[PDB]
Amino acid sequence: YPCPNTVDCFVSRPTEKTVFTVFMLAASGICIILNVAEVVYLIIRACARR
Amino acid sequence: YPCPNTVDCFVSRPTEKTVFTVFMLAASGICIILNVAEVVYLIIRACARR
């Protein structure tokens, strides 16, 4: 509301926004994986200390 | 086509057009009934001649 029935709307820059979204998502996923690996390595180092 | 999806359109004078349509339809129906009655009366007069 208040758009009557269904209307078509157009996004500004779909393809460029998609490319930047892919870049950001890949960076975030790599960050997650690296954080998990760092936690595991910290646990391994703590075990190796003892 | 080419109207996108469904759009709303507005008629100019719905109520006045409806009133005149009712008038014309009533006149036409009365004409039909009167024509039928005239045919029947012509048949009756032709029979009465014989």
Swiss-Prot record, chains A, B:
Changing residue 49 to H: In CMTX1; localized mainly on the cell membrane forming gap junction-like plaques. One gap junction consists of a cluster of closely packed pairs of transmembrane channels, the connexons, through which materials of low MW diffuse from one cell to a neighboring cell. The chain crosses the membrane at residues 22-44. Disulfide bonds: none annotated. It comes from Homo sapiens. Belongs to the connexin family. Beta-type (group I) subfamily. This is Gap junction beta-1 protein. It is linked to Charcot-Marie-Tooth disease, X-linked dominant, 1: A form of Charcot-Marie-Tooth disease, a disorder of the peripheral nervous system, characterized by progressive weakness and atrophy, initially of the peroneal muscles and later of the distal muscles of the arms. Dejerine-Sottas syndrome: A severe degenerating neuropathy of the demyelinating Charcot-Marie-Tooth disease category, with onset by age 2 years. Characterized by motor and sensory neuropathy with very slow nerve conduction velocities, increased cerebrospinal fluid protein concentrations, hypertrophic nerve changes, delayed age of walking as well as areflexia. There are both autosomal dominant and autosomal recessive forms of Dejerine-Sottas syndrome. The chain holds residues 171 to 220 of 283 of the full protein. The gene is GJB1. The lineage of its organism: Eukaryota, Metazoa, Chordata, Craniata, Vertebrata. Changing residue 38 to K: In CMTX1; non-detectable levels of hemichannel activation and non-detectable levels of electrical coupling. It is found in: Cell membrane; Cell junction, Gap junction. It comes from the Eukaryota. A connexon is composed of a hexamer of connexins. Interacts with CNST.
